[PDB]
Design a protein around this ligand. Sequence first.
Ligand SMILES: COc1ccc(-c2ccc(Cl)c(Cl)c2)cc1Cl
Length: 239
Amino acid sequence: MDIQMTQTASSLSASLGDRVTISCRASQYINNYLNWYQQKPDGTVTLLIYYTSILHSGVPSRFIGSGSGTDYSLTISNLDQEDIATYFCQQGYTLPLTFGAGTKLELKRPGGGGSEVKLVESGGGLVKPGGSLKLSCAASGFTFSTYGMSWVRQTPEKRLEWVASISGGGDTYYTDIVKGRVTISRDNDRNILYLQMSSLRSEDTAMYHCTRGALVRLPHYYSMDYWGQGTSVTVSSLV
Ligand SMILES: COc1ccc(-c2ccc(Cl)c(Cl)c2)cc1Cl
């Protein structure tokens, strides 16, 4: 059965300089294979922490990841304007890869927020149910052929859903609800990742992000260490 990730709070209210802890619970043991992502108000997603407690590049030591078993926490000290964002946990222990629903950090007053691997998605658009699209992701700034790559979509309700992954060697993995309706593929000469989509359904409407997989532990524990800005797919009988 799929591992469900629960973030009980959807938003926490705090003041600048405060310390806040965001909880994440897995429905099953996940061997500390837990990643945290930060999504800024403008939609930009970055990796924050991988393997429960290890900071991604650029991330300041004010972020502390902890936990074990099924219970995990992200503690942010000395809360800064740039931390006003939504935080998502994600287990990478078994397929399908699954995400919590997100916890936003907000300030007591309204408002808040502040600010070489490149991934650029294209090919989204509007189609009727039963239609088809092909998404592309142009990658640069790294040796593309050595990395696993994935597609992750964010629904209009703001849920992150892993769609598909492809290993450096070309093995493919999909979430059940898209199997037989999408195909992930890659061109290691042009450094492009693709998602062919057939028989689209209204519930495929989402922003589709290309992500680079970084292998954390063999055989297949990955973090999604860089994310594109996304390409938007809208499926509606009103098209
Ligand atoms: C059998 O279990 C798995 C198989 C494949 C992946 C996986 C996850 C992310 C990426 Cl980027 C890639 Cl290439 C493979 C992850 C798991 Cl848990």
